[PDB]
């Protein structure tokens, strides 16, 4: 079964081990170096729509934790910019580091952010998720930056239940919740063809991801660094550098939404 994490022992670097793929040709994150990084006309604006969204539950799964939602119908959706088709929300999660000079994944001229929240979407083509992680086009990842500066008031609800799902295999009830307030003011973008990047590493993603960072407090973060990658009554490994590193661009475009 999948013993991967973050550790020094079962981290990035030992991945390819039982992922091969790992050192494949469209792996994820990337550095977006924004000079090079070519501004295309002809990509459209997203159209993000959670007017409808559905959050049912958060589970602390090991590695982060995911707010899921009902993903049985078009509720929360995401079209246009890059895309093809309709891609439907399945869940959220963030990657965060164990100080805020590291944490996400993306970096923009090598620039590390505290923190980034990945809004994963499949493509309602494919009739479900799993047939979905199969095809080159088949996710959707709006990946969006965290900074430390004022609180996010839209984050704190999350914030607040993480104190019940503390270790590995834990879930709570996470209704009503409006992803909405998660998002910067500005959707100007850069796109580019990905992949997951957490095991197994599947090369099916369109990568959208947000120019402008949203800002988080201090406080709110250092709860993140609280939960655990262990289980319940295990040696406390606190949840942090769920990250993984950048991986080489090879033979991709990065293209911007912007002028
Ligand atoms: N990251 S991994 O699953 O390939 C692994 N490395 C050492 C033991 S298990
Ligand atoms: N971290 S990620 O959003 O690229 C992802 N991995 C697997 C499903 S979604
Ligand atoms: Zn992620």
Known sequence: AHHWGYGKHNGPEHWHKDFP??????????????????????????????????????????????????????????????????????????????????????????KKYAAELHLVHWNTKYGDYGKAVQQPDGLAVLGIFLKVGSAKPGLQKVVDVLDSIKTKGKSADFTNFDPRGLLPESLDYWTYPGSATTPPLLECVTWIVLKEPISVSSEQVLKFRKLNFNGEGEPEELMVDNWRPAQPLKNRQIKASFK
């Open 21 to 110: 793929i790992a050192k494949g040709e469209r792996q994820s994150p990337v550095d977006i170096d924004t000079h090079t990084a070519k501004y295309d006309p002809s990509l459209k604006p997203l159209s993000v729509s959670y007017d409808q969204a559905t959050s049912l539950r958060i589970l602390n799964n090991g590695h982060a934790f995911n707010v899921e939602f009902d993903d049985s119908q078009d509720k929360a959706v995401l079209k246009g910019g890059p895309l093809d088709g309709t891609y439907r929300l399945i869940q959220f999660h963030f990657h965060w580091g164990s100080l805020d000079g590291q944490g996400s994944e993306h970096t923009v001229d090598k």
